[PDB]
Design a protein around this nucleic acid. Structure first.
Ligand SMILES: [Zn+2]
Ligand SMILES: [Zn+2]
Lengths: 151, 151
RNA sequence: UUGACUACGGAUCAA
RNA sequence: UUGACUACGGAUCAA
């Protein structure tokens, strides 16, 4: 029983809310000192905003809470591997650590298609840990799309 | 080309607004049907939001007016080559064409360090044109950082 | 520590 | 068209 696992379950809770809203089931949690400072879930379809991915929303919420665009000492937990946009957002908010669940072989940019969080040419790189509760994180997606298609 | 200068002119004017606020002088304009539907300038320091880059703000404003996260038929004009975050946001909002002024040798991800807008593995790619009013776009930055250091 | 720097220069980079 | 698909499946990909 670890914090990483604990916080990921909280991210899965966010992913479930998204599923209840009819959105792709992806959730995110941001911590500082092992204290939740922000949480979010996918709201792209609900708000019709291209940036409404879970990580992106969480990052802006944490920035407001901390009073600065620099999220120093923060850790981001997300159920799915960050896409090109979120990976870049992580770089620009300078989050030092990212823990994610399932990999995204189709659009993942934190290890799959590329790792934008580990670029020597960027002014910031982040520690990247994957697999945390990936089975459960992955199940939410496959279930969602199964139903999406059936319907 | 002349149309491009017209809109980049408005992006520079927007960039100057950011300058007056003490922000890195970058501005953006989004058009649809040859009409301006959104404009914005850098607000990172003012709002203390890591996502407050000009094109990112313009994209969310564009999405709001269109009531859709898909920016079909839109053209983005920005005074500086989009960074990793903005390039990714451009991909996630599915903008068909991007026109930028000055190149960013240090962080540009639309041709310089890489081109996230021409990724074979992504579900979206855009036409990228560079150099429009390159000189004017570049000067703003050169001046900003010269004064910043002296400051 | 000095220098460089095109998204602050609180980052990064070179000695 | 027809299928596949892990950020809608309005995209992309494959025949
Ligand atoms: Zn994302
Ligand atoms: Zn940017």
């Amino acid at each position: 029983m670890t914090n990483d696992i604990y916080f990921m379950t909280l991210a899965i809770e966010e992913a479930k809310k998204a599923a209840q809203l009819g959105e792709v089931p992806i959730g995110a949690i941001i911590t500082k000192d092992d204290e939740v400072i922000a949480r979010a879930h996918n709201l792209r379809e609900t708000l019709q905003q291209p940036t409404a991915h879970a990580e992106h929303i969480a990052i802006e919420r944490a920035a407001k809470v901390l009073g600065s665009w620099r999220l120093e000492g923060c850790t981001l937990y997300v159920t799915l591997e960050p896409c090109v946009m979120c990976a870049g957002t992580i770089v620009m908010s300078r989050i030092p650590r990212v823990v994610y669940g399932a990999d995204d072989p189709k659009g993942g940019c934190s290890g799959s298609l590329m790792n934008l969080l580990q670029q020597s040419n960027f002014n910031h790189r982040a520690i990247v840990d994957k697999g945390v509760l990936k089975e459960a994180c992955s199940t939410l997606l496959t279930t969602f799309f199964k139903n999406l298609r059936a319907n």
